[PDB]
Design a binder for this molecule. Structure first.
Ligand SMILES: *[C@@H]1O[C@H](CO)[C@@H](O[C@@H]2O[C@H](CO)[C@@H](O[C@@H]3O[C@H](CO)[C@@H](O)[C@H](O)[C@@H]3O)[C@H](O)[C@H]2NC(C)=O)[C@H](O)[C@H]1NC(C)=O
Ligand SMILES: *[C@@H]1O[C@H](CO)[C@@H](O[C@@H]2O[C@H](CO)[C@@H](O[C@@H]3O[C@H](CO)[C@@H](O)[C@H](O)[C@@H]3O)[C@H](O)[C@H]2NC(C)=O)[C@H](O)[C@H]1NC(C)=O
Ligand SMILES: CC(=O)N[C@@H]1[C@@H](O)[C@H](O)[C@@H](CO)O[C@H]1O
Ligand SMILES: CC(=O)N[C@@H]1[C@@H](O)[C@H](O)[C@@H](CO)O[C@H]1O
Ligand SMILES: *[C@@H]1O[C@H](CO)[C@@H](O)[C@H](O)[C@H]1NC(C)=O
Ligand SMILES: *[C@@H]1O[C@H](CO)[C@@H](O)[C@H](O)[C@H]1NC(C)=O
Ligand SMILES: [Ca+2]
Ligand SMILES: [Ca+2]
Ligand SMILES: [Ca+2]
Ligand SMILES: [Ca+2]
Ligand SMILES: [Ca+2]
Ligand SMILES: [Ca+2]
Ligand SMILES: [Mg+2]
Lengths: 600, 506
């Protein structure tokens, strides 16, 4: 609703680097907000697509960004008889970037690792690794919870029990408020799905450079399961945190398993000990229910609500009956702790193969109406199939079924505009949260700024002299005593950070149903039913008032006296759209109908 | 007089026919009052307003190409007709619906194209041994069902990329099954082995030179193979005048779209042909798996009936996939695929036992209704598919095309086609929302304030200034009327002080 689509800031990374795959807001100690953008295909020192992370300072014009340097060299340490090895080529450094406090966590889910021991080996498998970094102090640390020195032979004898070799940890990352980094490892436990959590403070204090295999003493990992429903479930594709069980001393994790129970998909909510509290089964097979998850309180009841994306959901159009559009499921948390049930809203995409629901970003209170808002993206949606981001506003009963705004891709086709979304952070400090959209196909990131919202207040006070029988008030040109009445109009503009230059135009209307020739009521200044006034409400908290003088014709003049007199007041922003973009969004009763009638 | 035709205004001929089909318009110069020149046809005729000038378009559905249904498809496959009529001309006036019929018959000796898409994973090493003589045995069994059979072979394991493929030590790339002390082939995404050929002995020769590979995860990249076998017509060798059977044999799960992110692949499948001159899927490591919707679209586009020849452990999974993909059936494959020959014959009979209609390029303002009529005379309404048929049956589907409002293109065409068949009914829609009087298109003439309004279809359509019967108001038309007709000539004020100047009349 507020996101300005004309004044866009374009941050560009190197070409063919997928700059914009993952993005997040970073706040310095000074409070300045910067954008950390993941570019998981940035060329390394040896012309290999290792990966990279860019820390973009906030500028109105945007442009190139400095690169947050990480260690991109393969490591080999001989500890005991074994030989630990890390392979960072094509590791995708930047496929998941999350910022907490002064720490930026950039993950490389596809970093390989092997343990050579004489002839035997542990197999070069994408264990996955995440690089933690403090840009203001230069402290670098790593967190690879799925590295192990167990040789392959042992896994075969154990039927691949606790096989964390294919974890791809960092696929999805999130940091809780207390500071616990929760990494998602969909390939853990032989592609069953894994979740690893460790405090950020303990990762930094335990990381020793040069040591490739180490254990963080305070970390905790999920449990392997023998239930066939979990097999190949990719449990950890998307991870989110929130409060879903009452007391706030414990945080709850929301894990997306898009292929749970034979590609059905599921989203499970668990406590800090990975004990499942509630599971939300998918609706359609191969719909990828759980590809994206988001936790935010949309209906403003104080209780977090869960949003699940199913980008490949196929709807029944009654003409094709299977159209791959995508769907987003909204679950409102009830009074009871374990009471989540059927989805409260089903937001379905409209463009074929648009992958609606591929990214859900809680925007906070975008319009500051008292209810939080979300933004769903279709990376290949829109009429031209170039990408769309749809903004949905919260309300008392959930979300609006209808998007309040649609953001079209400013980038060419195939840019995947909307693959990465991030909001609820005021990057320009204008009082309204903004949104950053990542298009890794074009290697660019678009920043959408939320302009202020003005709540209009129209009150037209008209004297009840609508009867013409008084015949007392006179006209300036000719006495002609007629029952004229004064027209006192007041307009009020309310809203946070409203500019002082706001000059609304109030369009008065008298006897609107009657034509201009048949206007029964006219002013005493111009004798024209209705007028336009450019009131300058900007900078004035008071509901600026002003009275005007209007007169009615004689009794015999209007043979259709019985007809009611329709008075209308319409207010709208000034026609300055060509000169500059609309600095505000007028919201509320723009037009009011003060309908009266002639009695005497 | 009665009916909305009279009550809903007059304006021009465009407005009154656009209300409801029954409404008629008189364009010739006749009684100024009486009929609002917008009533029904018989009311307008009652007022004698038709000097062969009554305008009343009627929705019609006339056929253009109506070759009769063929009885046997053995000879002259280019002249085998399975749908009649083949092309009709449909005229629809606004908010009107016309019904038409389409007979679909599946001929007996129609050519069959069977492409064997085999999962060459390690668990199907024994399956490859039971296929060595499938080509000879398939020709004998298909002999009684067709006189022109073509068979081909293709293989798939998965995307040759970690974590799907073992990458260590270097000897595990040229022999992925080194550690069970065996020799395998390097992992491949999809290799096209044999082009569809009638010489069934080539199938036996080409299938005994195949070898299995070894991947790591349970799911296999099979939907990638289905996409490439579907969209590579010139490579696989599909025939336009033949039934297209895609036998998809596997024993494990399948990778779907967005599962390629595990290997670092995010680029969606574009549905193009990426098989090169080396008969290998060259974009297997750079492009994501296809989704169900994209895979379904290409199957319908290429008229391919997909057969799931899956083992018992995944029969329920692929039975649920088949419910989302029209024209597909699932058979229970053996652990060594020893009954795949009987599976193909049963699936072909099962596939041909159901006729399902499919509409393409349908305008967004058109709504279709199908009343299926299967064997005997069961007119089951609301159904566009008949089930329980056999080879040689002749089903019929009454279709009703209704148009919301009136599209401005006035010329659209859509096609109604049975699933898996090239033959289709081409419907040409010709919307009729204008009259013959508008062809004259009379500009501002002397009858409308001496050149202040168009005299088309009798009623003078004219700008907001000059309104009224004779487009001469020059003001609003209500208080000033059009020609102060309220005051008859002179000496008579507002109709002798009875009717004032209102509604542009005395
Ligand atoms: C293919 O799809 C079918 C559904 O169309 C799957 O079967 C269904 O599986 C669910 C559990 O995942 C069953 O739900 C349970 O049913 C019992 C009995 O009604 C009920 O008491 C439980 O509360 C729960 O709802 C469901 O009944 C079952 N449907 C049928 C018809 O058996 C099937 O598993 C899928 N096959 C796959 C994914 O391979
Ligand atoms: C599919 O079959 C249905 C049912 O036969 C068709 O609709 C029905 O068509 C009949 C014949 O036009 C309609 O009959 C007439 O109904 C009016 C009242 O609505 C009555 O005054 C007439 O005397 C006559 O009985 C019938 O109403 C209608 N039913 C409905 C619910 O619309 C339908 O047209 C067929 N579709 C196709 C594609 O042929
Ligand atoms: C194939 C490819 O990557 N082409 C790009 C080109 O589009 C871009 O304008 C240029 C600027 O660096 O870099 C290169
Ligand atoms: C009769 C009248 O005033 N209609 C108003 C129009 O003037 C205004 O432009 C629009 C939106 O501002 O809302 C309506
Ligand atoms: C949460 O922890 C605080 C620590 O100050 C404690 O006072 C409070 O009682 C705790 N709430 C619980 C355990 O529900
Ligand atoms: C339309 O339906 C009516 C009533 O069943 C039938 O008489 C008529 O022949 C049908 N028209 C076509 C073209 O099917
Ligand atoms: Ca809690
Ligand atoms: Ca809530
Ligand atoms: Ca809001
Ligand atoms: Ca802002
Ligand atoms: Ca087997
Ligand atoms: Ca596999
Ligand atoms: Mg297998």
């Amino acid at each position: 609703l507020n996101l300005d689509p004309v004044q866009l800031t374009f941050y560009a990374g190197p070409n063919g680097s997928q700059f914009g795959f993952s993005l997040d807001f970073h706040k310095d100690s000074h409070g300045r907000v910067a954008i950390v953008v993941g570019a998981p295909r940035t060329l390394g020192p040896s012309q290999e697509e290792t990966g990279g992370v860019f820390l973009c300072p906030w500028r109105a014009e945007g442009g190139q960004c400095p690169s947050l340097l990480f260690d991109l060299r393969d490591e080999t340490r001989n500890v005991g008889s074994q030989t630990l090895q890390t392979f960072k080529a094509r590791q995708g450094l930047g496929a998941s970037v999350v910022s907490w406090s002064d720490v930026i966590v950039a993950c490389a889910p596809w970093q390989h690792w092997n343990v050579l021991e004489k002839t035997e080996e542990a197999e070069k498998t994408p264990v996955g690794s995440c690089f933690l970094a403090q840009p203001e102090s230069g402290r670098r640390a790593e967190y690879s919870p799925c590295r192990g020195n167990t040789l392959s032979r042992i896994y075969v004898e154990n039927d691949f029990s606790w096989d964390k070799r294919y974890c791809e940890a960092g696929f999805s990352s999130v940091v809780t408020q207390a500071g616990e980094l929760v990494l998602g490892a969909p390939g853990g436990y032989y592609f069953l799905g894994l979740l690893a959590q460790a405090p950020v403070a303990d990762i930094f204090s335990s990381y020793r450079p040069g040591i490739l295999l180490w254990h963080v003493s305070s970390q905790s990992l999920s449990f392997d399961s023998s239930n066939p429903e979990y097999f190949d479930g990719y449990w950890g594709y998307s991870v989110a945190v929130g409060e879903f069980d009452g007391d706030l001393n414990t945080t709850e994790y929301v894990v997306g398993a898009p292929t749970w129970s034979w590609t059905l998909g599921a989203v499970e909510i668990l406590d800090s000990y990975y004990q499942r509290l509630h599971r939300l089964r998918g609706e359609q097979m191969a719909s990828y229910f759980g590809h994206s998850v988001a936790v935010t309180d949309v209906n403003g009841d104080g209780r977090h609500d869960l949003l699940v994306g199913a980008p490949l959901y196929m709807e029944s159009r009654a003409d094709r009956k299977l159209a791959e559009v995508g769907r987003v499921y909204l679950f409102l948390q009830p009074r009871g702790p374990h009471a989540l049930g059927a989805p409260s809203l089903l937001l379905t995409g409209t463009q074929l193969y648009g992958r609606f629901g591929s990214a859900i970003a809680p925007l906070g209170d975008l319009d500051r109406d008292g209810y939080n808002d979300i933004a769903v993206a279709a990376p290949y949606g829109g009429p031209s199939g170039r990408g769309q981001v749809l903004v949905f506003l919260g309300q008392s009963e959930g979300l609006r079924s209808r998007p309040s705004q649609v953001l079209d891709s400013p980038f060419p086709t195939g840019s995947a505009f909307g693959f990465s979304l991030r909001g609820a952070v005021d990057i320009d400090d204008n009082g309204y949260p903004d949104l950053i959209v990542g298009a890794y196909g074009a290697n660019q990131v678009a920043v959408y700024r939320a302009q202020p919202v003005v709540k209009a207040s129209v009150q037209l006070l008209v004297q009840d002299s609508l009867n013409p029988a008084v015949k007392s008030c006179v006209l300036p040109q000719t006495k002609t005593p007629v029952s004229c009445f004064n027209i006192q109009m007041c307009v009020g503009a309310t809203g946070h950070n409203i500019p002082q230059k706001l000059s609304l135009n109030a369009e008065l209307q008298l006897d609107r149903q009657k034509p201009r020739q048949g206007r029964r009521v006219l002013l005493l200044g111009s004798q024209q039913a209705g007028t336009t006034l450019n009131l300058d409400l900007g900078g004035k908290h008071s509901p600026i008032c002003h009275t005007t003088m209007a007169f009615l014709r004689d009794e015999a003049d209007f043979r259709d006296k019985l007809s009611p007199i329709v008075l209308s007041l319409n207010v709208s922003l000034p026609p300055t759209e060509a000169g500059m973009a609309p600095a505000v969004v007028l919201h509320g009763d723009t037009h009011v109908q003060e309908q009266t009638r002639i009695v005497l | 007089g009665p009916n909305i035709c009279t009550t809903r205004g007059v304006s021009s001929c465009q407005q009154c026919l656009a209300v409801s089909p029954m409404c008629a318009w008189c364009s010739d110069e006749a009684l100024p009052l009486g009929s609002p020149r917008c009533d029904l046809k018989e009311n307008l005729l009652k007022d004698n307003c038709a000097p062969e000038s009554i305008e009343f378009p009627v929705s019609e559905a006339r056929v253009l190409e109506d070759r009769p249904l063929s009885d046997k498809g053995s000879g002259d496959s280019s002249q085998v007709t399975q749908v009649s009529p083949q092309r009709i001309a449909l005229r629809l006036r606004p908010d009107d619906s016309k019904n038409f019929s389409i007979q679909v018959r599946q001929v007996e000796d129609y050519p069959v194209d069977i492409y064997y898409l085999m999962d060459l994973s390690y668990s199907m090493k024994d399956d490859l041994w039971s296929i060595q003589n499938l080509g000879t045995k398939l020709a004998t069994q298909m002999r009684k069902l067709t006189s022109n059979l073509r068979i081909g072979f293709g293989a798939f394991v998965d995307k040759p990329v970690s974590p799907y493929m073992y990458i260590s030590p270097p000897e595990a790339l040229e022999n992925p099954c080194y550690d069970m002390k065996t020799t395998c082939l390097p992992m491949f995404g999809y290799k096209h082995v044999l082009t569809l050929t009638d010489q069934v002995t080539r199938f036996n020769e080409e299938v005994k030179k195949q070898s299995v590979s070894r991947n790591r995860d349970a799911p296999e990249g099979g939907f990638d193979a289905i996409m490439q076998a579907t969209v590579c017509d010139e490579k696989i060798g599909w025939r336009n005048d033949a039934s297209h059977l895609l036998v998809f044999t596997t024993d494990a799960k399948t990778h779907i779209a967005l599962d390629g992110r595990l290997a670092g692949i995010v680029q969606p499948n574009d549905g193009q042909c990426h098989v090169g001159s080396d008969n290998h899927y060259s974009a297997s490591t750079t492009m994501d798996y296809p989704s169900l919707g994209l895979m379904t679209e290409k199957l319908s586009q290429k008229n391919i009936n997909l057969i799931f020849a899956v083992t018992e452990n995944v029969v329920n999974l692929y039975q649920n996939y088949s419910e989302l993909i029209p024209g597909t059936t699932v058979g229970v494959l053996s652990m060594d695929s020893s009954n795949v020959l009987q599976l193909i014959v049963d699936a072909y009979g099962k596939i041909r036992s159901k006729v399902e209609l499919e509409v393409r390029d349908l305008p967004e303002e058109l709504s279709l209704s199908f009343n299926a009529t299967c064997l005997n005379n069961e007119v089951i309404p609301g159904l566009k598919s008949c089930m329980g048929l056999k080879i040689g049956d002749t089903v019929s589907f009454s279709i009703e095309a209704k148009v919301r409002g009136c599209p401005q293109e006035k010329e659209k065409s859509f096609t109604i086609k049975p699933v898996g068949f090239k033959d289709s009914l081409i419907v040409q829609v010709t919307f009729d929302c204008d009259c013959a009087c508008q062809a004259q298109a009379e500009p501002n003439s002397h009858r409308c304030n001496n050149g202040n309004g168009t005299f088309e279809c009798g009623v003078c359509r004219c700008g907001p200034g000059w309104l009224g019967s004779q487009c001469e108001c020059s003001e609003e038309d209500y208080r000033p009327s059009q020609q102060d007709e309220c005051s008859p000539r002179e000496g008579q004020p507002v109709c002798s002080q009875r009717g004032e100047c209102l509604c542009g009349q005395c």
